[PDB]
């Protein structure tokens, strides 16, 4: 059957093939067979966040703003710098109730700074009583208040107007956190500020703020019907912070150093483990060798771009033509 | 007319044939015959069919967007909305331009290359029984009746049976 | 399921060729010639990793971004932030599909063209000492042992010293 002379040769040249080829799409067809195809998306996650390149700060039922204001159970986050703050869904406030205008603005800017380094300052408080306390904010089984704030009360049933000021001379910016306490009735305003009305006015060399207290009733949270509205001010180097008020003032103890860097915040419930990876995702950590991923749109660090496709096969060989009846 | 099987794959094409995309035209003692090949035109059509189904009917569902036109005037917020809308139109317009200009190049390259194999396939089946010249035709020996056209169309053409008869023409 | 000098690129894909990618297989007086070949496997490889390294490891830096999901319904700001990421995901997803589809076509086209260059390189190597029956296989006359066949792969194969035997198993 193999008819062949001792001079006639063949020199048949060909390529390789595999019995099992990979299914992968092209621009003309969609079901062409190539030898091996490599995945181009990262559809799997480890399930934990590892703080190998970055310094990860855990939540532990403490949101970022609550640690900023100085809650009693959040007192473990004093002057602790971080590279990426992780917020847990189990977070809940356990102190005096409060709200802030532009909640996302204050949360984003202090997360970008990534530094809660706070320095106490000696404000010249004359004609007030400091260290005000409340029964809904307990520390060490005793009544307390926000750790970084200072409630003010009359001394001999008198509240003289406060004309305190202090300048800024350091080369960096200064961030001040101050608030206004809203009473629940006209009796409380007289009994806690010795004045029927009230006004708060802070000002810098480039901007000013003015808040009028809003008296009235509010729903009870933690056996307290009052509210505190907290505002933030940015003090440039060489600027002067002048505060004039006649009541309903929550005094700040000092200033918070801010900067510009790579720190941010992210809400996730993933635990903390030990690995060596850069990508941070609410589902956990993912490898970054793939050029694309479809785990979650929220990410941090050196991460692949997010796509909505589940799988993207990329050919790494040549077309497969196997079998031929044997 | 002049006849001669003038062109094909060089100079001009054919307009009379409608039944397919690529065909054959032979001249011999029996006259002139024309018939199309259904194998080569299938690949060109399927590649073209692969273009249409990948774009026609493929649309994503968008339900709620921002306002795109405003009868009033505002500051940063309105200006930002006009800016984010303008840069999306520019990117999509450029993506459309790069898409159609690349599909056409592949379509023209593939169609020329796909039926290039059709001309190359016949030459490899006429390794010694035919010659080639510059208008895409052949010089097929031996005497090529209706059977040889069908045999080379259906691929069952044997070069060895008419091998020695082909060489006298090559001899002179 | 038998050794009968099976065809090459246009018909089949071999399974015993694992060390190389584009190898030869000769059937001479000895009988077997399945072996690997160089400078053609690596050339096909070269464009493959070049696509890979540019695609694997090329990662950009993004640290602080806007919130992507919200728990409270807001006005135009939340609507704008939701859209400004919907258009970003949609444009990146189309860019990924267009990239991998275009990257795929050039992979198959280059590999098919790379072997076609190899096949014609041997075809121009032997000027008139061999022809092809039309299946990527040659028909080499004259006394060709494994040393004669191996000399074809490595470059030196003189046509004129083998001219006398070539023309006797040919046209004459």
């Amino acid at each position, epitope marked *: 059957l*193999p008819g062949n002379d001792n001079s006639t040769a063949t020199l048949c040249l060909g390529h390789h093939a595999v019995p099992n080829g990979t299914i992968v799409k092209t621009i003309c067809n969609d079901q062409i067979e190539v030898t091996n195809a490599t995945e181009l998306v990262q559809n799997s996650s480890i399930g934990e966040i590892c703080d190998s390149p970055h310094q990860i700060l855990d939540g532990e039922n403490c949101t970022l703003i609550d640690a900023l204001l100085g809650d009693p159970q959040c007192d473990g986050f004093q002057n602790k710098k971080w590279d990426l703050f992780v917020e847990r869904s189990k977070a809940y406030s356990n102190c005096y109730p409060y709200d802030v205008p532009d909640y996302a603005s204050l949360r984003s800017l202090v997360a970008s700074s990534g530094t809660l380094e706070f320095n106490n300052e000696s404000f010249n408080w004359t004609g007030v009583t400091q260290n005000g306390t409340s029964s809904a904010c307990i520390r060490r089984s005793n009544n307390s208040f926000f750790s970084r704030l200072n409630w003010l009360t009359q001394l001999n049933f008198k509240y003289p107007a406060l004309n305190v000021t202090m300048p800024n001379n350091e080369q960096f910016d200064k961030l001040y956190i101050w608030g206004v306490h809203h009473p629940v009735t006209d009796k409380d305003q007289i009994f806690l500020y010795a004045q029927s009305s009230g006004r708060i006015t802070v000002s810098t060399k480039r901007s000013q703020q003015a808040v009028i207290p809003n008296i009235g009733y509010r729903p009870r949270i933690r056996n307290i019907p009052s509210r505190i509205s907290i505002y933030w001010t940015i003090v440039k180097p060489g600027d002067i912070l002048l505060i004039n008020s006649t009541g309903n003032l929550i005094a700040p103890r000092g200033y918070f150093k801010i900067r510009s860097g790579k720190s941010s915040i992210m809400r996730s419930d993933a635990p903390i483990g030990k690995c060596n990876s850069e990508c941070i995702t609410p589902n956990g950590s993912i490898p970054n060798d793939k050029p694309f991923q479809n785990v979650n749109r929220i990410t941090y660090g050196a991460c692949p771009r997010y796509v909505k496709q589940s799988t993207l096969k990329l050919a790494t060989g040549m077309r497969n033509v196997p079998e031929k009846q044997t | 007319g002049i006849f001669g099987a003038i062109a094909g794959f060089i100079e001009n094409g054919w307009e009379g044939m409608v039944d397919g995309w690529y065909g054959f035209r032979h001249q011999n003692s029996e006259g002139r015959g024309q018939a199309a090949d259904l194998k080569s035109t299938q690949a060109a059509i399927d590649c073209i069919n692969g273009k249409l189904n990948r774009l026609i009917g493929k649309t994503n569902e968008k339900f709620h967007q921002i306002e795109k036109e405003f009868s009033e005037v505002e500051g940063r917020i309105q200006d930002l909305e006009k800016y984010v809308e303008d840069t999306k139109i520019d990117l999509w317009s450029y993506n459309a331009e790069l898409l159609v200009a690349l599909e056409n190049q592949h379509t023209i390259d593939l169609t020329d290359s796909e039926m290039n194999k059709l001309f190359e396939k016949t030459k490899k089946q006429l390794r010694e029984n035919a010659e080639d010249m510059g208008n895409g035709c052949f010089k097929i020996y031996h005497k090529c009746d209706n059977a040889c056209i069908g045999s080379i169309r259906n691929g069952t053409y044997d070069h060895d049976v008419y091998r020695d008869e082909a060489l006298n023409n090559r001899f002179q | 399921g038998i050794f009968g000098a099976i065809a090459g690129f246009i018909e089949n894909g071999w399974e015993g060729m694992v060390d190389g990618w584009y190898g030869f297989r000769h059937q001479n007086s000895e009988g077997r010639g399945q072996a690997a070949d160089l400078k053609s496997t690596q050339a096909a490889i070269d464009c493959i990793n070049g696509k890979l390294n540019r695609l694997i490891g090329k990662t950009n830096e993004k640290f602080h971004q806007i919130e992507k999901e919200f728990s409270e319904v807001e006005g135009r700001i939340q609507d704008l932030e939701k859209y400004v990421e919907d258009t970003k995901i949609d444009l990146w997803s189309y860019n990924a599909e267009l990239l991998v589809a275009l990257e795929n076509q050039h992979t198959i086209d280059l590999t098919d063209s790379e072997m076609n260059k190899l096949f014609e390189k041997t075809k121009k190597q032997l000027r008139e000492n061999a022809e092809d029956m039309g299946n990527g296989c040659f028909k080499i006359y004259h006394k060709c042992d494994n040393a004669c066949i191996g000399s074809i792969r490595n470059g030196t194969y003189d046509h004129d010293v083998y001219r006398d035997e070539a023309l006797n198993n040919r046209f004459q």
Partner: antibody
Amino acid sequence: QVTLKESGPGILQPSQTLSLTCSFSGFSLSTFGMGVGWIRQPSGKGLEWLAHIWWDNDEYCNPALKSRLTISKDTSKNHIFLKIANVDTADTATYYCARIFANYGGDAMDYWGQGTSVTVSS
Amino acid sequence: QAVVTQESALTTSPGGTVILTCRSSTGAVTTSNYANWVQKKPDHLFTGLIGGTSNRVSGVPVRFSGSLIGDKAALTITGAQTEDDAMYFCALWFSTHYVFGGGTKVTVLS
């Protein structure tokens, strides 16, 4: 010496299954280029080639009897088995198992068996 | 279906030359058809003569030879003897199966 022997039932009823076993000595199916074929003669008409089995488990048979012919081999005990399904009066024939040599240039029909008469009747 | 047709019968004296043919209705007969010639004596078993249209089975005398005569295969018996009175059959390969011919009865006047 190369010898081939055929064995069969001889008398079969219509629409039964024909089983034939070929016994041979002097060669084995493990050698390259070796095969055994089946050829039947209806005792008066011409010759009819049925099928053969090559040494690499390659099967070739008559297309007119593909659905009814099954043929296998046993290398250990050097036997060739042939099965015919749905026998008829046209299958009444003398069946020969024979050696076919696969060499360069073609196949050689060198050695043949004695044969075994098969009769199909009711 | 590829029927194979040869001569019905032939006659010769002891010593004459007999040329048998094997014709195929599918077309040209080539070396790829692998013509096989087998003879059948009335009392002896089947013995093959020519395989692959040119290769001779060892053991047969020199008077038997096979070749290609034009469009058909052929078997040549130069100087036939009294032992050549036997049936003669031809087989052709059609790339899937072997087809045997009708047979040629070579009769030698003994």
